[PDB]
Symmetry: C3
Subunit: 151 residues, 3 copies
């Protein structure tokens, strides 16, 4: 019978954690995070070249923003808009020009290219930036763009 009461104790401890944490989730994401589905985008608030931004995300236990649906892209757009700085996405066509892939090598399952993009301008645009309007444009990886990671 002590076990039933033992379960009764846990239930109360779990309810408290659930309630307290739900409040902190909101506090934490304000103002540099955006939750969408089971994914969370978090911006560093500063700009870095692709290779550097990529390293920051992976070392933090995540990866560069990789919107895989319209919902995710719009969520990401909210941050870019708020910071008013275009950001880098994780995908590139550095291995096979014309073929963009996620850091894993998988082909894109979603894309929101601005009209005429990607266009490998100047013959050297292998990274992707997302504008404040939410559209994508392949851009030189050496450029500095807002760092946004997904977790």
């Amino acid at each position: 019978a002590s076990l039933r009461q033992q379960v009764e104790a846990l239930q109360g401890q779990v309810q408290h954690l659930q309630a307290a944490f739900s409040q902190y989730k909101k506090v934490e994401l304000f103002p540099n995070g955006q939750s969408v589905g089971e994914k969370i985008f978090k911006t560093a608030g500063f700009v870095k070249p692709f290779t550097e931004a990529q390293l920051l995300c992976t070392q933090a236990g995540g990866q560069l923003a990789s919107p895989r649906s319209a919902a995710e892209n719009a969520a990401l757009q909210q941050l870019v808009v708020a910071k008013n700085e275009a950001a880098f996405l994780s995908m590139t066509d550095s291995k096979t020009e014309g073929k963009f892939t996620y850091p894993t090598g998988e082909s894109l399952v979603y894309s929101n290219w601005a009209p005429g993009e990607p266009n490998d301008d100047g013959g050297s645009e292998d990274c992707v930036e997302i504008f404040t309007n939410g559209k994508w444009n392949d851009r030189a990886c050496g450029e500095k763009r807002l760092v946004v990671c997904e977790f």
Copy 2:
């Protein structure tokens, strides 16, 4: 057979979670948050006009700072003093001049107006700012003040 080996593992998990969560809360509130009662104030660290600041909070699942007691005002004041930037509160008298209300329309249940305030200076101050001294002053909503939301 009444193994209860499950209750054991659960107890350990919850205990660790309580410790980990408590540590996490401290980390989150440092340095832009303040916990008072069941409420949590958090500043974005930058300034914005009222409408913009108000949107940021509501979109984040909260609302602009709304101190309803001396204790809450004191907590909010700590943040304002830290950033050394007056911050917008949620209350306005935009609907009926000379009558300030919370975003819900309710009448103020607490106030800490500086001497002579609110004075609708220039006949156009319908928003409220809290100075570093903790006192309130009605100010033009178009001015840019520290964004502090409550959750």
Copy 3:
């Protein structure tokens, strides 16, 4: 008896809570925090004199960064390098010149002094700063350095 579905139900709750907490924790640390062992470092992103920095950390429920091993020092270094600003540690030799101690009074169990340090330059360097290279240097407590607390 039928307590199996309850304890089994809690398993799901606690584990779902553990997964969400795990994700929000990674989000929380990017980009101003670093986890090492059971300790967490988090920078305020700005500089303050020692006394002010120490008060901020204590009032937040923690203390100034106190690397007690090469691993912890390396973790702290990442934050310093990221902000490109030397940070204050919690240790001082205010009590007895030449003898650095943690806030508790305990002698150092680890140190990473740069060559020639600590030298008590000017006859008044009782605080400690960590350079972007990870090496330590005693410096005047009245100087302003990056604020990094540990929790």
